[PDB]
Design a protein around this ligand. Structure first.
Ligand SMILES: COc1ccc(CCc2nc3cc(-c4c(C)noc4C)ccc3n2C[C@H](C)N2CCOCC2)cc1Cl
Length: 110
């Protein structure tokens, strides 16, 4: 639905909003592995994803349905849970942002 894609865009805007910036910020841009010294990142993560990429895809009308959008958002979180030890600060931030996402995604119009 166009309606469902608008709900997805609303979620995306919320994830990027000041309200959630304290825990969303690591997810704003692609992981710069070389800059961070994470020289194994691209050997472990096959499909990098981040909120700027989700935004560009939405703006370019790449997503054809809500589930395609959701798969990229969940991919972003899964990459974080795969790469980082579960006690890492960034994983705590991911869990909080994923809670924001999942509870609002569940309110999808249908
Ligand atoms: C110009 O504005 C910026 C400022 C900072 C960044 C990227 C910084 C960054 N971006 C990061 C992305 C990750 C990350 C994520 C998210 N998922 O796996 C990894 C690795 C991890 C660290 C990242 N870090 C380092 C920081 C200091 N984190 C360390 C760990 O605890 C949370 C804070 C990018 C931009 Cl564009």
């Amino acid at each position: 639905l166009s309606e469902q894609l608008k709900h997805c865009n609303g979620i995306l805007k919320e994830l990027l909003s000041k309200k959630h910036a304290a825990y969303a910020w690591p997810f704003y841009k692609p992981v710069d592995a070389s800059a961070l010294g994470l020289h194994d990142y691209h050997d472990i993560i096959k499909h990098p994803m981040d909120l700027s990429t989700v935004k560009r895809k939405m703006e370019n009308r790449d997503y054809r349905d809500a589930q395609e959008f959701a798969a990229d958002v969940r991919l972003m979180f899964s990459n974080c849970y795969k790469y980082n030890p579960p006690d890492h600060d960034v994983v705590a931030m991911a869990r909080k942002l994923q809670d924001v996402f999942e509870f609002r995604y569940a309110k999808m119009p249908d």
